[PDB]
Amino acid sequence: QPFQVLVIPFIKTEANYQFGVLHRTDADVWQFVAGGGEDEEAISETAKRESIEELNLDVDVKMYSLDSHASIPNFHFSFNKPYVVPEYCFAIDLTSCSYQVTLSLEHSELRWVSYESAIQLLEWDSNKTALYELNERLKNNDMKAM
Amino acid sequence: RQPFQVLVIPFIKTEANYQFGVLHRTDADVWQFVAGGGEDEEAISETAKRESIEELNLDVDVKMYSLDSHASIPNFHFSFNKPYVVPEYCFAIDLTSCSYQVTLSLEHSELRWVSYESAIQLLEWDSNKTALYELNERLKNNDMKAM
Ligand SMILES: [Ca+2]
Ligand SMILES: [Ca+2]
C-alpha Rg value of chain A to the nearest Å:
15
Q: Phi and psi dihedrals of B138, rounded to 5?
A: -60, -40
Contact assignment for B69 to A84 by CB distance below 8 Å: yes
Q: Is the Cβ–Cβ distance between B37 and B5 less than 8 Å?
A: yes
Mapped onto helix, strand or coil, the DSSP state of residue A44 is: helix
The yes/no answer on whether domain B1-146 falls in CATH 3.30.310.50 is: no
Judging contacts by C-beta atoms under 8 Å, the chain A residues touching residue B84 are 67, 132-133, 136-137
Reported for A27-32, long-range contacts at CB under 8 A and 24+ positions apart, including other chains, are A29/A123, A30/A118, A30/A121, A30/A122, A30/A123, A31/A107, A31/A122, A31/A123, A31/A124, A31/A127, A32/A6, A32/A7, A32/A8, A32/A122, A32/A127, A32/A130, A32/A131
Task: Identify any residues that bridge with A18 across adjacent strands, giving them in sequence order.
Answer: A11
> Residue A65 pairs with which residues in a beta bridge?
A90
Domain ranges of chain B: 1-146
Phi, psi of B102 (to 5 degrees): -70, 130
| Best residue of B130, B138, B141, B145 to probe chain A, by most A CBs closer than 10 Å | B130
CA–centroid distance, residue A107 to ligand 1 (Å): 9
Nearest to B31 by CA among B140, B121, B97, B92: B121
Domain A1-145 carries which CATH code?
3.90.79.10
One-letter amino acid of B68: D
The resolution in Å comes to 1.7
Compute how many other C-beta atoms are within 10 angstroms of the C-beta atom of residue A37.
19
Q: What angle do CA A38, A40, A42 make, to 5 degrees?
A: 85
Chain B residues touching residue A70 (CB < 8 angstroms): 70-72, 126-127, 130
**B62: helix, coil or strand?**
coil
- Minimum CA–CA partner of B76 in chain A: A132
How was it solved?
Answer: X-ray
Helix (H, G, I), strand (E, B) or coil at B122: helix
